[PDB]
Design a protein around this ligand. Sequence first.
Ligand code: MG
Ligand code: MG
Ligand code: MG
Ligand code: MG
Ligand code: MG
Ligand code: MG
Ligand code: MG
Ligand code: MG
Ligand code: MG
Ligand code: MG
Ligand code: MG
Ligand code: MG
Ligand code: MG
Ligand code: MG
Ligand code: MG
Ligand code: MG
Lengths: 186, 147, 125, 121, 47, 52, 52
Amino acid sequence: GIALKNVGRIKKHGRKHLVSKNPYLRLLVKLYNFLARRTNANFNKIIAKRLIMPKRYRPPLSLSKLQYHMANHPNDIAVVVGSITDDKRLFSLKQLKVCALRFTETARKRIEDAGGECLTFDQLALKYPTGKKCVLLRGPTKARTAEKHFGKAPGKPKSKARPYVRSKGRKFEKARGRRKSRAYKK
Amino acid sequence: ATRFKKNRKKRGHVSAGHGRVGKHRKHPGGRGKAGGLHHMRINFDKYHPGYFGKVGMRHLNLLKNRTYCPTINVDKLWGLLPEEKKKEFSENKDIAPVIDVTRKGYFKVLGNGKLKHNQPIVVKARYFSSVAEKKIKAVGGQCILVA
Amino acid sequence: AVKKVGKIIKKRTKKFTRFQSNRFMRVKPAWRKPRGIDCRVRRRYKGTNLMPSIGYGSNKKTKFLLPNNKYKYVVKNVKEMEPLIMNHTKYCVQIAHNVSSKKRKQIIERAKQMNVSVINAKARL
Amino acid sequence: SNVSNALVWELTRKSNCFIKKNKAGKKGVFLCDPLNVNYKNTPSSSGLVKSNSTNVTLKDGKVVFSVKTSKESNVVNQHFKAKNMKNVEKLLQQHGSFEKAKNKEKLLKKYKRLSKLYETS
Amino acid sequence: PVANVYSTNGKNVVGEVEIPVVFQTPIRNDLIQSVYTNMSKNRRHPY
Amino acid sequence: PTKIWRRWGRKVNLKEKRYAVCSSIAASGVTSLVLARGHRISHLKEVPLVVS
Amino acid sequence: KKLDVIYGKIHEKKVTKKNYILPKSIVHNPDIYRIIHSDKVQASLLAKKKPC
RNA sequence: ACGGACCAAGGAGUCUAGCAAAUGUGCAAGUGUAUAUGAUUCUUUAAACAUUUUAUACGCAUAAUUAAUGUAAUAUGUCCAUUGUAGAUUUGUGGUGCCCCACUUUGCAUACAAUACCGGUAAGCAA
RNA sequence: UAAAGCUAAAUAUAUGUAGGAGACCGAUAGCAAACAAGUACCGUGAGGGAAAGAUGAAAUAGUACUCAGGAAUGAGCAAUUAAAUAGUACCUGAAAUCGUUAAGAUGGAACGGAUUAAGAGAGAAAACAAGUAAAGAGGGGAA
Ligand SMILES: [Mg+2]
Ligand SMILES: [Mg+2]
Ligand SMILES: [Mg+2]
Ligand SMILES: [Mg+2]
Ligand SMILES: [Mg+2]
Ligand SMILES: [Mg+2]
Ligand SMILES: [Mg+2]
Ligand SMILES: [Mg+2]
Ligand SMILES: [Mg+2]
Ligand SMILES: [Mg+2]
Ligand SMILES: [Mg+2]
Ligand SMILES: [Mg+2]
Ligand SMILES: [Mg+2]
Ligand SMILES: [Mg+2]
Ligand SMILES: [Mg+2]
Ligand SMILES: [Mg+2]
């Protein structure tokens, strides 16, 4: 015998392969695995990892937030591993160069009308092999509604979690345990 | 599909996954929402705090059509126009648009966001909030009440 | 008991019979894993039936070879045995059970022309 | 621009009318497509994946010489009638310039093996 | 990118047509399979 | 005992049905794919194959 | 020829699908190995390394 | 301690409603063509196809809070997009072997805090 | 605009009768009932309620003749059929249980795991010989 933990074997804690079956995505995975291996650049490793993640870890990015992130980076390229969407709250748009996995129709029209362009990842592999003058960006990953129920249970003192309820009103879970007048508040 | 069900994995084992000592008996704690306030109290208290008791006034015959009122913020107010029509109002300084939000299904104009500086606009609606009305007056516009 | 002829090594030759299959005739000899408290075969008492395990596995380099030292491919008609003209020194053919005598004669006389061996070229004659 | 050789490998690795595998005698799997010199199931030997190829088969009683030479999706299957070794050597010169010698002598040996098969009437 | 038009005797070529742009849709076998195994349930009969 | 209110059918998104039809027409225009479905078209001239 | 009027390249009343857009791809050119063999990419690769 | 004289066939976590988490797919500030109607749909077809010749059926989402009358998210000096610490990626020099360091540039996601504003309640003043 | 009245269509249909169909069951299944089935049978009565399909293409081929025997039945030098070890208890014909012959073992249970030995049955696909010369029978491809 011998006194090891998890005997002599090393633990890893994440996703290892694609689950999706889109042939084009499989070709992309092959390409960026090759690029990551043969030029250890830390730019292609991260991209090779990000396009393996599940849907909830590839959130969309709005046009306005993308323009805000690129304000001090003229004539550079923004790289997103998600979709980018339109934003009616903006009045005007600048000229931008953006590579993303998907664009919506309105966002694609607005970008090209200002003189910009939209890129796929196989073109970025051909023009910026090691990511020179490229900026990696992510969207908000904890803005989903499901994350509002996680954390401390609703009922523990000073929590912020939403409850699961049929509907909302004065008759739906507002009496005992949420006000001092019925025996205690939270 | 019955092909991928978890029970097919336990087909040779004795207890079907429910244990030797504590079996799978039928309703060993009650039916439905039975034991709350007595022996299900902790689950109720930590997952649904304000469940017991009543509060407020009764409304005997509601008729919800009397208080229907969808809203729109001043953020989304220039976005209702098409981009080409949005464009010419920037160059020309002598003309402003007049927008009737009740033709789009909105009833009350609400005041979150920012309007473009020195870009006048005229808005029609049934209700306005104070902040929204001030923000419309600031860039050189006017609010009009309809019915 | 280890058996070895050339480079092929077999780590055991006897079957793993089912526990209690020699005493009760409603119990068939095909191996089933013993479950259930107090077995003496599940608990590895000495003197009873052994259990199979991955340790008896065969060498990857010699895992499917026959004593002929070739792999076996089963054919049903003439057109199926044409991929063997490129790899004739590593494969041997065997004719399926449900083909008629007339079909068998042709399969055999083509295998002879291709210089591939036939495992059961004596049936229905 | 929506298709390439690597995408044809992805689409036809598993589902196909030409794959044959052996359930008894677990080793091996064969591709019988008409333009596959060997019978390997690899992207580098299947006629469906490759743009240009040559092969010799039988296809009815006699022996046939085949060329694919599909440059720009203008796929042009040509079919000839192999007659003897010298004619096949001429045909390799005429239509198989894109190949290497190591491939040419492989095809020549294959043809030699095929020229010993026959039946009755 | 065009295509020839063949006559009904299989020998003459009597025209050419520009290939429609629907032929440039990405070819997705996983999506086709998944969509097909739901639409094929709709013609079944009860028992 | 089996029942008649087993859910016999499915409802499919309209956009996905249209996507599938479109991506299926495109596969009809690739020579290698038609060959790999079992059609004996070795002697054909063009795979889109328009006729008068 | 009807296949261009149905999908909106040419517009026509009561034949074209209303407001339907033809799907796009997440890849521009799926030929990966033509990209890998380009001079730009090859100039960034690193010397081949040895196994153990 | 209980069941088992023997053999063959049969024999036990399933179906529907409603909710959630995980994952795959489509589109995206929207999304889902309900009941119906149409068609040169009609063995199959009880399937498939279509949508009424500056465009208000309905659900969920896009805004909260209060018993309630109700009220409703920086603010017009600038289409700008609140503040700090750590932090992925990028920019310019030098060190040892594209990598890691010492400065320089930019500052995603997120963690910890600060500040402003909206609904209810106290306090102060109140036509 | 109460304390009088009539009135089609769009809706339902575990009944009766007819028609069409299925990713349904296949004689311990499917209706209780694929057959003279709500039948045979049980209860004073209200009621309860089964088991049981298949020779062969053709019996317009269902077993003629002889011998033994009181008879059943058996046997044949004799007989239908492609077939009778398909003979009406008739397609195929498993296991439990029993008969016959052969070969072994056997001092108050039997069978088993490991390892060898002595007998017995079966076996050539690696468990030797390409090619060379002569003659005999065949089958193909080119010019
Ligand atoms: Mg050990
Ligand atoms: Mg267990
Ligand atoms: Mg138990
Ligand atoms: Mg073995
Ligand atoms: Mg124990
Ligand atoms: Mg007991
Ligand atoms: Mg007993
Ligand atoms: Mg989900
Ligand atoms: Mg609702
Ligand atoms: Mg106020
Ligand atoms: Mg006063
Ligand atoms: Mg009346
Ligand atoms: Mg029927
Ligand atoms: Mg019955
Ligand atoms: Mg029969
Ligand atoms: Mg004695």
